[PDB]
Amino acid sequence: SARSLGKGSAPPGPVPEGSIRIYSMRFCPFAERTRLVLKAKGIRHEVININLKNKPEWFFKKNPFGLVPVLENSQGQLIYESAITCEYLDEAYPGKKLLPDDPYEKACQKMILELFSKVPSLVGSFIRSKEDYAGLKEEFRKEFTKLEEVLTNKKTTFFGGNSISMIDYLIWPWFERLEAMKLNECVDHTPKLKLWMAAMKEDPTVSALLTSEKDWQGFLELYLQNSPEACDYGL
Amino acid sequence: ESARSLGKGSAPPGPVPEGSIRIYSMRFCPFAERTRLVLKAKGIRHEVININLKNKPEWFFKKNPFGLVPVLENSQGQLIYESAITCEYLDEAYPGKKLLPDDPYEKACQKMILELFSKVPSLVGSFIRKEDYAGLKEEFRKEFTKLEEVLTNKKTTFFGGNSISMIDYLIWPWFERLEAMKLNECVDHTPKLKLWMAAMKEDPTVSALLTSEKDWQGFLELYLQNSPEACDYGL
């Protein structure tokens, strides 16, 4: 049931009443954002994994950009872009809100997300390709000092207060891979950010969705080998 | 004159008065025009401080760590930057008619359409910055086709329905500069987008904030030569 769907696969059926579907990939950190929100809010859903190296022909009608995550509900409505999917889920579902309702506090979370914007591309660059490592670790350190400054100025344990909120879940997938990439020395000069990473791993939602560093390395070696079995590593 | 832009050696501004809000802007900046369209549409009491973008004051780098306009500042000293964030903050923080739909899926559609528009501001910048023209005009036609497909599927005059909403004000500044840049032919294959442009010019908020073709070309001639008088052209 978790095996990814690829080129030649049959278009999926309609999403059943009272449920939502996520088009995802088990090792995609952008989709992990949406799955953290789905788990934190206790939302009943179904997962369809997409083979990103051998995409189903029907997947391009779900998203014109051809990227995961994509949400699909029973009315056939489609929502793409990880940040948009997270905001939509917090708005359309009941229970405790992950986004603060104060307009300024909500704007701060979106400004912090923009301060984090260079981190996903650095992770991408690090994974790919070596003599480049030194320069890239320096780049990581500079970006992390910007997040250290936010926590210093806020005087809180998390990026949106003394308890976890949307902003923490949005940036967590990249800090999760940091240790798997053996780049933990990049937070050795950011003590508040380091304490934040330890607090995040103790969160029940974060903890339930962690990928083991061996499963991630299994995926990565298959991905770097350009294998169409990468998305399905560990079955 | 309160409108002349502030440069190096200017005194840092005083506190924002109670009941008001300040926008740090530049009269020919399309990103800050988004924010000004929202302040005008919602009838928000505010003050404008223009920044000399070719002679930036030192005190301004404390208002935004990116050093860009627009920036909002209130009486509590709160600072909000990134044009899309400033617009959403104003819609939530102030009374009157909401520019954003209340439905979570309709709100998500507005943010997805904004993403479909994302290449247009950088093509405008590349065009203003040959022979390059033919290629750049073809890129404009491809991007404008994407917007025409949205209007074709919605069967409405505007991007969020039968009435003007936030998404229209967010993309309008770049369509406003088409005639000025002599790029009207780039929409001659997009009839619905062409009717939308005419409908936008009829809107009282849009009409009140239009820049004359002469003031714009007058600004551009000075800005391209790094003139410190560029931002204050037309007085």
Numbering used by the authors:
A (entry chain B): 5 to 133, 136 to 241
B (entry chain A): 4 to 132, 136 to 241
Q: What's written in the study?
A:
GSTOs have a cysteine residue at the catalytic site in place of the characteristic tyrosine or serine. Consequently, instead of glutathione conjugation, GSTOs catalyse thioltransferase reactions similar to glutaredoxins. We determined the structures of GSTO1 bound to three inhibitors (C1-27, C1-31 and C4-10) by X-ray crystallography.
The GSTO1–C1-31 structure was determined to 1.94 Å resolution with two molecules in the asymmetric unit. In each case, difference electron density maps contoured at 3σ show each inhibitor covalently bound to the Sγ atom of C32 in GSTO1. All three inhibitors bind primarily to the hydrophobic or electrophile binding site (H-site)5 of GSTO1, but do so in unique ways. C1-31 and C4-10 bind solely through hydrophobic interactions, whereas C1-27 binding incorporates both hydrophobic and hydrophilic interactions. The position of the acetamide group of C1-31 is stabilized by hydrophobic interactions with the side chains of G-site residues L56 and V72. The seven-membered ring is flanked on three sides by Y229, I131, L226 and F225.
